[PDB]
Coordinates of C-alpha atoms and ligand atoms in Angstrom, one line a residue:
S1 CA 39.7 -103.9 -38.2
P2 CA 42.6 -102.3 -36.3
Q3 CA 42.1 -99.6 -33.6
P4 CA 40.7 -96.2 -35.0
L5 CA 44.1 -94.4 -34.8
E6 CA 45.9 -97.4 -36.4
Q7 CA 43.3 -97.5 -39.2
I8 CA 43.6 -93.7 -39.8
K9 CA 47.4 -94.1 -40.2
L10 CA 46.9 -97.0 -42.6
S11 CA 44.6 -94.8 -44.6
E12 CA 47.2 -92.1 -45.0
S13 CA 49.8 -94.7 -46.0
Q14 CA 47.5 -96.1 -48.6
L15 CA 46.2 -92.8 -50.0
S16 CA 49.4 -90.9 -49.9
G17 CA 47.3 -88.0 -48.5
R18 CA 46.5 -86.3 -45.2
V19 CA 43.5 -87.5 -43.2
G20 CA 42.0 -85.3 -40.5
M21 CA 39.6 -86.9 -38.0
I22 CA 37.7 -86.1 -34.8
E23 CA 35.3 -88.4 -33.0
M24 CA 33.4 -86.5 -30.3
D25 CA 30.5 -87.3 -28.0
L26 CA 27.5 -85.2 -29.3
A27 CA 25.9 -84.6 -25.9
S28 CA 29.1 -83.6 -24.0
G29 CA 31.8 -82.7 -26.5
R30 CA 34.2 -85.3 -25.1
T31 CA 36.9 -85.8 -27.7
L32 CA 37.6 -89.6 -28.2
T33 CA 39.9 -89.6 -31.2
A34 CA 41.8 -86.7 -32.7
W35 CA 44.2 -86.9 -35.7
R36 CA 45.5 -83.8 -37.4
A37 CA 42.6 -82.1 -35.6
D38 CA 44.1 -78.7 -35.7
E39 CA 45.3 -78.8 -39.4
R40 CA 43.4 -77.2 -42.2
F41 CA 41.3 -79.1 -44.8
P42 CA 39.0 -77.9 -47.5
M43 CA 35.4 -78.1 -46.3
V44 CA 34.0 -78.8 -49.8
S45 CA 30.3 -79.6 -49.6
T46 CA 30.3 -80.1 -45.8
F47 CA 30.1 -76.3 -45.4
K48 CA 26.4 -76.5 -46.4
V49 CA 25.5 -77.7 -42.9
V50 CA 27.0 -74.6 -41.3
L51 CA 25.3 -72.5 -44.0
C52 CA 21.9 -73.7 -43.1
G53 CA 22.7 -73.2 -39.4
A54 CA 23.3 -69.5 -40.3
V55 CA 19.9 -69.5 -42.1
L56 CA 18.2 -71.0 -39.1
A57 CA 19.8 -68.5 -36.8
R58 CA 18.1 -65.8 -39.0
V59 CA 14.8 -67.6 -38.8
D60 CA 15.0 -67.7 -35.0
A61 CA 15.7 -64.0 -34.9
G62 CA 12.7 -63.2 -37.2
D63 CA 14.9 -62.1 -40.0
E64 CA 14.1 -65.0 -42.3
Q65 CA 11.3 -67.6 -42.8
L66 CA 11.8 -71.2 -44.1
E67 CA 8.5 -70.6 -46.0
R68 CA 9.8 -67.6 -47.9
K69 CA 9.8 -68.3 -51.6
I70 CA 12.9 -67.3 -53.6
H71 CA 12.7 -66.8 -57.3
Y72 CA 15.8 -67.0 -59.4
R73 CA 17.0 -67.0 -63.0
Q74 CA 18.8 -69.5 -65.2
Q75 CA 21.9 -67.3 -65.3
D76 CA 22.1 -67.8 -61.5
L77 CA 22.7 -71.5 -61.8
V78 CA 26.1 -73.1 -61.3
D79 CA 27.3 -76.7 -62.0
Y80 CA 25.1 -79.4 -60.4
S81 CA 21.7 -78.1 -59.7
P82 CA 19.5 -81.2 -59.7
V83 CA 16.6 -79.6 -57.7
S84 CA 17.0 -75.9 -58.4
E85 CA 17.1 -76.3 -62.2
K86 CA 13.5 -77.7 -62.0
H87 CA 12.1 -74.6 -60.4
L88 CA 13.0 -71.6 -62.6
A89 CA 9.3 -70.8 -63.1
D90 CA 8.0 -71.4 -59.6
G91 CA 10.9 -70.8 -57.2
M92 CA 11.9 -72.6 -54.0
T93 CA 11.3 -71.8 -50.4
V94 CA 14.3 -71.1 -48.1
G95 CA 13.6 -74.4 -46.4
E96 CA 13.5 -76.3 -49.7
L97 CA 16.7 -74.7 -50.7
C98 CA 18.4 -75.9 -47.5
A99 CA 17.0 -79.4 -48.1
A100 CA 18.3 -79.4 -51.6
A101 CA 21.7 -78.1 -50.5
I102 CA 22.1 -80.6 -47.7
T103 CA 20.2 -83.7 -49.0
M104 CA 21.3 -83.4 -52.6
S105 CA 24.3 -81.0 -52.5
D106 CA 22.5 -78.8 -55.0
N107 CA 25.1 -76.1 -55.6
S108 CA 22.9 -73.4 -56.9
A109 CA 20.6 -73.9 -53.9
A110 CA 23.7 -73.3 -51.7
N111 CA 24.7 -70.1 -53.5
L112 CA 21.1 -68.8 -53.3
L113 CA 21.3 -69.4 -49.5
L114 CA 24.8 -67.9 -49.2
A115 CA 23.5 -64.7 -50.7
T116 CA 20.8 -64.5 -48.0
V117 CA 23.4 -64.7 -45.1
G118 CA 25.8 -62.1 -46.6
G119 CA 28.0 -64.3 -48.8
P120 CA 31.1 -66.1 -47.8
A121 CA 32.1 -63.1 -45.6
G122 CA 28.7 -63.2 -43.9
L123 CA 28.9 -66.9 -43.1
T124 CA 32.4 -66.5 -41.8
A125 CA 31.1 -63.6 -39.6
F126 CA 28.4 -66.1 -38.3
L127 CA 31.1 -68.6 -37.5
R128 CA 33.0 -66.0 -35.5
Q129 CA 29.8 -65.1 -33.6
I130 CA 29.3 -68.7 -32.5
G131 CA 33.0 -68.9 -31.3
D132 CA 34.6 -70.6 -34.3
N133 CA 37.7 -68.5 -34.9
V134 CA 39.2 -70.9 -37.5
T135 CA 36.7 -72.1 -40.1
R136 CA 36.5 -69.7 -43.1
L137 CA 34.4 -69.5 -46.3
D138 CA 35.9 -67.3 -49.0
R139 CA 34.3 -68.4 -52.3
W140 CA 31.0 -69.5 -53.8
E141 CA 30.0 -72.8 -55.5
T142 CA 31.8 -74.3 -57.3
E143 CA 35.2 -72.5 -56.9
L144 CA 35.3 -73.2 -53.2
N145 CA 36.1 -76.9 -54.0
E146 CA 39.4 -76.0 -55.7
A147 CA 41.5 -77.3 -52.8
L148 CA 44.8 -75.8 -53.9
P149 CA 47.8 -77.0 -52.0
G150 CA 48.5 -74.7 -49.0
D151 CA 45.5 -72.4 -49.7
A152 CA 43.7 -71.4 -46.5
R153 CA 40.5 -70.4 -48.4
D154 CA 37.3 -72.4 -47.7
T155 CA 38.9 -74.5 -45.0
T156 CA 38.1 -75.8 -41.5
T157 CA 39.9 -78.0 -39.1
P158 CA 38.4 -81.3 -37.8
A159 CA 38.3 -79.9 -34.2
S160 CA 36.7 -76.6 -35.3
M161 CA 34.1 -78.3 -37.5
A162 CA 33.1 -80.8 -34.9
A163 CA 32.8 -78.1 -32.2
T164 CA 30.7 -76.0 -34.5
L165 CA 28.3 -78.7 -35.5
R166 CA 28.0 -79.6 -31.8
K167 CA 27.1 -75.9 -31.1
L168 CA 24.5 -75.8 -33.9
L169 CA 22.8 -79.1 -33.0
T170 CA 22.8 -79.0 -29.2
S171 CA 24.0 -75.8 -27.5
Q172 CA 20.6 -73.9 -27.6
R173 CA 22.2 -71.2 -29.8
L174 CA 19.5 -72.3 -32.2
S175 CA 15.9 -72.7 -31.1
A176 CA 14.6 -76.2 -30.4
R177 CA 12.7 -76.4 -33.7
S178 CA 15.8 -75.1 -35.6
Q179 CA 18.1 -77.7 -34.0
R180 CA 15.6 -80.4 -34.9
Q181 CA 15.4 -79.2 -38.5
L182 CA 19.1 -79.1 -39.0
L183 CA 19.4 -82.6 -37.7
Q184 CA 16.5 -83.9 -39.9
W185 CA 18.2 -82.4 -43.0
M186 CA 21.3 -84.5 -42.2
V187 CA 19.2 -87.6 -41.5
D188 CA 17.6 -87.1 -45.0
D189 CA 20.9 -87.0 -47.0
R190 CA 20.1 -88.8 -50.3
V191 CA 23.7 -88.6 -51.7
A192 CA 25.5 -90.8 -49.1
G193 CA 22.9 -91.7 -46.4
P194 CA 21.3 -94.7 -48.1
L195 CA 24.6 -96.1 -49.2
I196 CA 26.0 -95.8 -45.7
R197 CA 23.0 -97.5 -44.3
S198 CA 23.4 -100.4 -46.7
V199 CA 26.9 -101.2 -45.2
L200 CA 26.1 -100.4 -41.5
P201 CA 25.3 -103.2 -39.2
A202 CA 21.7 -103.2 -37.9
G203 CA 21.2 -100.8 -35.0
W204 CA 23.6 -98.0 -36.1
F205 CA 22.3 -94.5 -36.6
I206 CA 23.6 -92.3 -39.4
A207 CA 23.1 -88.7 -40.4
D208 CA 25.6 -87.0 -42.7
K209 CA 26.7 -84.4 -45.2
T210 CA 29.6 -85.4 -47.6
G211 CA 31.7 -83.5 -50.0
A212 CA 34.3 -83.8 -52.7
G213 CA 36.8 -81.5 -54.4
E214 CA 39.9 -81.3 -56.4
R215 CA 43.3 -83.0 -55.6
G216 CA 41.5 -85.8 -53.8
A217 CA 39.6 -83.5 -51.3
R218 CA 36.9 -85.4 -49.5
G219 CA 34.9 -84.8 -46.4
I220 CA 32.2 -86.1 -44.2
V221 CA 30.5 -84.7 -41.2
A222 CA 28.3 -87.3 -39.5
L223 CA 26.4 -88.4 -36.5
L224 CA 26.9 -92.1 -35.7
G225 CA 26.0 -94.5 -32.9
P226 CA 24.6 -97.8 -31.8
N227 CA 21.2 -98.5 -30.4
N228 CA 19.8 -96.1 -33.1
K229 CA 21.1 -93.1 -31.3
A230 CA 23.2 -90.1 -32.6
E231 CA 25.9 -90.7 -30.0
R232 CA 28.9 -89.2 -31.7
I233 CA 29.9 -86.6 -34.2
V234 CA 32.5 -87.9 -36.6
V235 CA 34.3 -85.5 -38.9
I236 CA 36.8 -86.9 -41.5
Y237 CA 38.6 -84.9 -44.2
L238 CA 41.0 -86.1 -46.8
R239 CA 43.3 -83.9 -48.9
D240 CA 46.2 -84.1 -51.4
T241 CA 45.7 -87.7 -52.4
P242 CA 45.7 -88.8 -56.1
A243 CA 43.5 -91.8 -55.2
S244 CA 40.3 -92.8 -57.0
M245 CA 37.0 -91.7 -55.5
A246 CA 36.3 -95.4 -54.8
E247 CA 39.4 -95.9 -52.8
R248 CA 38.9 -92.7 -50.8
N249 CA 35.3 -93.9 -50.0
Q250 CA 36.7 -97.3 -49.0
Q251 CA 39.3 -95.7 -46.7
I252 CA 36.7 -93.5 -45.0
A253 CA 34.4 -96.6 -44.6
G254 CA 37.4 -98.5 -43.1
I255 CA 37.8 -95.8 -40.5
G256 CA 34.1 -96.1 -39.7
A257 CA 34.5 -99.9 -39.4
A258 CA 37.4 -99.4 -36.9
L259 CA 35.1 -97.1 -34.8
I260 CA 32.2 -99.7 -34.9
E261 CA 34.5 -102.6 -33.9
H262 CA 36.0 -100.6 -31.1
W263 CA 33.2 -98.3 -30.0
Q264 CA 33.5 -98.5 -26.2
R265 CA 36.4 -96.1 -25.5
Ligands
MA4_301 O1 31.1 -106.7 -34.9 C1 30.7 -105.5 -35.5 C2 30.1 -105.7 -36.8 O2 31.2 -106.1 -37.6 C3 30.8 -106.3 -39.0 O3 30.3 -105.0 -39.5 C4 31.1 -104.4 -40.5 C5 30.2 -104.2 -41.7 O4 29.8 -105.4 -42.3 C6 31.0 -103.3 -42.8 O5 30.1 -103.1 -43.8 C7 31.3 -102.0 -42.0 O6 31.9 -101.2 -43.0 C8 32.1 -99.8 -42.5 C9 31.0 -99.0 -43.1 C10 31.0 -97.6 -42.5 C11 30.3 -96.6 -43.5 C12 30.9 -95.2 -43.4 C13 31.0 -94.7 -42.0 C14 31.0 -93.2 -41.9 C15 30.1 -92.8 -40.7 C16 30.6 -91.7 -39.8 C17 31.6 -90.8 -40.5 C18 32.8 -91.6 -40.8 C19 32.5 -92.7 -41.8 O7 32.1 -102.2 -40.9 C20 31.5 -103.0 -39.9 C21 32.5 -103.2 -38.8 O8 33.6 -104.0 -39.2 C22 29.7 -107.3 -39.2 O9 29.2 -107.3 -40.5 C23 28.5 -107.0 -38.3 O10 27.6 -108.1 -38.3 C24 28.9 -106.7 -36.8 O11 27.8 -106.2 -36.1

């Protein structure tokens, strides 16, 4: 594999789309690689990690409990609800809803949680409270994946998202138990985690949340490192590419391969 920046460039050439990428030390926030890091990209399903950070912040303040059972109706369900469609009779706890949203990208689970934090506006207000003045959620699932060209709704930047995930996982804004829970939800991703592990060399840690939307939109927020440690946050977004989902996956994986082959920077 070429150097990380060279591979990122090669990925834009091949996809005919924009890639945005930050690689950041988790413990310190050192930025190692930055490409289009201040440009906007649709968050797609990656927003669900920030969503559950807002939920945890409410838990820490005594305004929410992960145990609290939420009951909902079939009319509340939106497209792709693999866990939530099973619990119309018995409901789901707030914590179960976060696990379904993060580890299965259950869309109805995400909307149920979004309601509890004040909707898209509430989540954006939370972002501002933690010092992210750029990321914005405007819509609910699944309209937030529309990724129209030039539309600022439902976007982040690679630098903002990386700084925000660092803040949620490590800055002690959340309690120790809350930080540990958000991390464990990412470790438990069933959508992409096992697949990523199957192609990672032995010894590499992965935790992640991925997303996809229209017009080629794709995202991953991840923790990655050798020696089974969550050494770095890696955020990669793609937008405005006509490429197959397989090719977008292959290009993201190629960026990961360049990081692995040239880790010591
Ligand atoms: O010398 C480094 C390594 O080089 C290869 O590993 C390859 C591996 O066989 C391939 O499967 C992977 O694909 C990359 C898979 C990455 C998966 C997605 C990464 C995510 C994670 C973080 C967010 C961005 C993307 O690349 C590595 C590095 O070339 C060898 O197979 C392995 O024995 C050796 O230890």
